[PDB]
Design a binder for this molecule. Sequence first.
Ligand SMILES: NC(=O)c1ccc[n+]([C@@H]2O[C@H](COP(=O)([O-])OP(=O)(O)OC[C@H]3O[C@@H](n4cnc5c(N)ncnc54)[C@H](O)[C@@H]3O)[C@@H](O)[C@H]2O)c1
Ligand SMILES: NC(=O)c1ccc[n+]([C@@H]2O[C@H](COP(=O)([O-])OP(=O)(O)OC[C@H]3O[C@@H](n4cnc5c(N)ncnc54)[C@H](O)[C@@H]3O)[C@@H](O)[C@H]2O)c1
Ligand SMILES: O=C(O)/C=C/c1c[nH]cn1
Ligand SMILES: O=C(O)/C=C/c1c[nH]cn1
Lengths: 550, 550
Amino acid sequence: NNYRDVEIRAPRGNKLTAKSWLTEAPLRMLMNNLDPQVAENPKELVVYGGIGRAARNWECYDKIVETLTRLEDDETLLVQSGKPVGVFKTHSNAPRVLIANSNLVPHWANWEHFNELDAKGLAMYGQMTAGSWIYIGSQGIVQGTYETFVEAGRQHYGGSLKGKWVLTAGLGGMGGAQPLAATLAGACSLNIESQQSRIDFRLETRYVDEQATDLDDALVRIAKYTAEGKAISIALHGNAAEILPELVKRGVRPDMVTDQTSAHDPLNGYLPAGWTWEQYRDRAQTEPAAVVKAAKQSMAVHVQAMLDFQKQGVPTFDYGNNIRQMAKEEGVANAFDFPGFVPAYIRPLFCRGVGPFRWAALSGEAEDIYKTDAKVKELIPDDAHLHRWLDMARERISFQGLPARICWVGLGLRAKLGLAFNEMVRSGELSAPVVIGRDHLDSGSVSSPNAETEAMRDGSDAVSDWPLLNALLNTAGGATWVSLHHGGGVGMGFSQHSGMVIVCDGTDEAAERIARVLTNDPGTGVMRHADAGYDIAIDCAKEQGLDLPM
Amino acid sequence: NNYRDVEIRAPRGNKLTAKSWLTEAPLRMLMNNLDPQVAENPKELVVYGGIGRAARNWECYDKIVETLTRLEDDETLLVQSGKPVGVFKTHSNAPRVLIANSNLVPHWANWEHFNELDAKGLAMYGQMTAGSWIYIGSQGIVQGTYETFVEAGRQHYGGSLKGKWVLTAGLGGMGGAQPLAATLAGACSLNIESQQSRIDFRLETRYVDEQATDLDDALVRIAKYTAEGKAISIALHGNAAEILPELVKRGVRPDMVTDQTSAHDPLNGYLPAGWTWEQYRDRAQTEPAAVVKAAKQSMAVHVQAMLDFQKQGVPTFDYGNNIRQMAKEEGVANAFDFPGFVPAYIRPLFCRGVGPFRWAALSGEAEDIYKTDAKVKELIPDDAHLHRWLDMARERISFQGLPARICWVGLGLRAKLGLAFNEMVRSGELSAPVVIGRDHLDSGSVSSPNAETEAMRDGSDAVSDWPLLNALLNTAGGATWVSLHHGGGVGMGFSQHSGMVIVCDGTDEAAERIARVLTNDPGTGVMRHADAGYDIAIDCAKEQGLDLPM
Ligand SMILES: NC(=O)c1ccc[n+]([C@@H]2O[C@H](COP(=O)([O-])OP(=O)(O)OC[C@H]3O[C@@H](n4cnc5c(N)ncnc54)[C@H](O)[C@@H]3O)[C@@H](O)[C@H]2O)c1
Ligand SMILES: NC(=O)c1ccc[n+]([C@@H]2O[C@H](COP(=O)([O-])OP(=O)(O)OC[C@H]3O[C@@H](n4cnc5c(N)ncnc54)[C@H](O)[C@@H]3O)[C@@H](O)[C@H]2O)c1
Ligand SMILES: O=C(O)/C=C/c1c[nH]cn1
Ligand SMILES: O=C(O)/C=C/c1c[nH]cn1
């Protein structure tokens, strides 16, 4: 049903399968989302973050690939929670694919109802980029995690994190980026992961450096390495709900604490203390309500450990998995005494429309991306932080599936880069068309009170009109495929966000769509923060010449 | 900032204030939504359904009118909860305005949080067509209420309703259509309403015939007219929470029972038993929490009375105001023993894409609608029910604000009508362009478990992907203005729905957009119900040649 023993990888080269590049792109990106080197559990259509899938089930997967292949340049495919439900006439400048995943009427917006619908074959969790086909392995979130650690270091350790270490958990698709991000930020790290296969995955993709043999050994390495001013990431096989409380008991003092286990989903993404991942998976089907409760009780203990570390003065933050909320519902009243990573460290970037901007080379050529890297340095000649990030990505980020690049940039530069990339496809510099996208985590594409829009200065945390407008505007502007998801990141009920991907096929038509959607997409973000009253966003809006009526 | 002592009415004739008809249309309809003859309390920007508003406040109202006035042909205004927050470049075949009102992240989708936001000047409830500018007074819902009664009559009373009577309450904007709908369906009716001014509004607009002086006088009139085979509506000043329970106790037996008070918003639309509307609105801002408690306690008793009538064999149904939910939450465990109006009576019509399709003459001339009435009969020459509806409308439906017409037709005919009207504008048969829209209650534009999607056969009630896809597709196809609202009809947390309006300016460009959007819009409705498994929808899909992959 949801299992098929096959290996899927995106077609390479310039030979189309679909009718045009605008339809070949989503077809290749859907497949890239399931590439064995990219996705966590693709045989079950799982890309990342708990049960974030690319298609509802295999029959729907087959139908999506079949429909996408026949889709015309003036037709638009509607994908409803991982299922191709309809094809309607639009035009060549409208999106070829329109996607709405996991959306539920609020009163029924919970995992329990979602699970009920899933059992009836009526649901699919799109996470953020899983159901919208713009996932590129751990590289997708790595720059954001890096920026979060860098900013935390600037705020608490006057700059460099040399000799310092981060304590966290979760080496899944996105969590796996934590160790490399810590390392690139100059810190060592103790990354606790309950599944050996995931630690192996991070090692194979060179995102974590080594694995300790036990807790004491892990601490001996951290002690050695930190004393040496080295930045080495260490994986520790175990349960966060057991280890963090133990380290607190021992008086161990990390330099910064966070967590990235899939706490957003108690049933499938967080292991109860003392359970094996195998007991967890079986019981989840037997006593789901009981599994959920055990998962949340451990989260309570886990967050209480995080609070104790904070009480000791160690910078502590929630990294968007909604674990505080879970802990809080389980009795930990002061669960929100430590902040989310955005209001604490990243919001300033969102005010300038800066976010996880990304692109992938459909050709599959590593050199296509290197060429784009060079072009960006040429287009942004005076940003040493950015040039250093591109260097680090080139030297330390290994490609997963189709070569792709994560490069944080905001309002103004996104379109500059996009038009430039389109010019490179046209001239033949890039061997094949490239797709520009981003995570749904971005300045104007997400409303999530426990993550991206936590503590907005005006109290607008829960207002979700913005992401809806971003998707609508992206559709009007001409992105190649637009999406509207629910619950990505923090789980059912806590978020609404949009996605967009636009194809640079070297044509003049593309350049026309690219100029406006890459101005509008980040523009809605600047707009959204200027509306909230952020001076940085209002200044950016003015400098970029945004037309903000009020 | 929320009250302004002025009378607003849509500009008339052919003179343009905006730069083109595509931008003049939303400007005129916005104003039309506030016509003294259309809205329920326009001086407070209130259009209908509790606190459903056309703009957030008067400052934002002027700003939208202003922006709409200068908006270019390739620009798109973004309206966020009734606020003109930004303008971005798109293209002439995309919507001029993208509207997103009242959307809140699920976990915070409740009146309590909405009110907090409203107080901080951060919200506006758009109901369905209030904030989307396509409300045409009581005529908007009347045929739908009429169809519901006709169908209930075919199901329970052999067909025609001669000598039968309906018992209901709420003579507000939409509720005011109940008495006339009953009459057009051939039944008498007792409509209880707590505000005399509202009873006067329906009387002046010809939606209700007379006012009893009390319960006994009312019962004497029902008994008399019913025995005589007459079809007259009676208004009765009072509180349904008191009247219904009383009638149950007297052994009175209506032939059909329902309700249309604004139970969806306890704080603003439902008078507690024994309270004067004066005390109600004063205490609303004094002890809101207490007022909500009081209002809901009355809803419980009201629903119980309704449950009692059903026990007596009286066909009873919820008419989309979420009163059952409120009663259930108030201890009335079996509050859902009587069904919502769509699964019981209207769903088959939705399966064919039939719904509250309508259009308005921007000219302001009645003869423009009369010409469309005649045109419709010409294009649908073999639908006597349709013709009979047009005759009754011309006969009993008084125009409100700009001459408009409600006309239930579905997949296929909508585009036939839209293209014809466009051609009448082009040839001059029609004074000025007409706008074609609908309510958000329609086949593929709303998910509402306690209303439009109540009891879907596959249990997909809460799936809200559909309306988001409808809005996305309408944007892609070329509607003039597209909207996505939250909580219309049933209130905060219980619904998500889209809206659309397309202008027919006689242009070929408008022509190509009409063919697409007027096919796609109802098309998503047939798709949505076909997906749920309804054979009637599947057949319609096949007849109309819809492209539904699965
Ligand atoms: N805020 C944002 O916008 C944002 C962005 C990306 C990801 N996220 C969230 O980050 C979290 C992780 O993402 P992912 O892709 O790595 O999820 P994942 O399911 O691919 O991996 C999660 C890992 O957590 C491990 N784990 C679970 N419980 C554990 C425990 N008690 N001790 C040690 N390890 C445990 C699991 O073994 C798994 O390997 C998710 O909640 C995801 O939603 C948020
Ligand atoms: N299901 C749908 O798609 C749909 C469509 C249209 C309207 N509705 C709903 O129908 C309801 C009414 O709409 P509206 O436009 O008339 O709202 P409204 O606010 O304009 O009018 C409500 C009327 O109810 C009266 N009232 C309140 N409590 C009363 C009581 N206890 N006894 C007698 N009268 C009482 C008020 O005086 C007022 O006249 C709302 O809940 C609205 O959302 C649902
Ligand atoms: O980096 C990505 O591709 C998406 C990461 C994400 C954000 N929210 C949930 N997953
Ligand atoms: O007919 C209209 O103008 C809208 C009626 C409506 C639907 N839901 C709430 N109000």
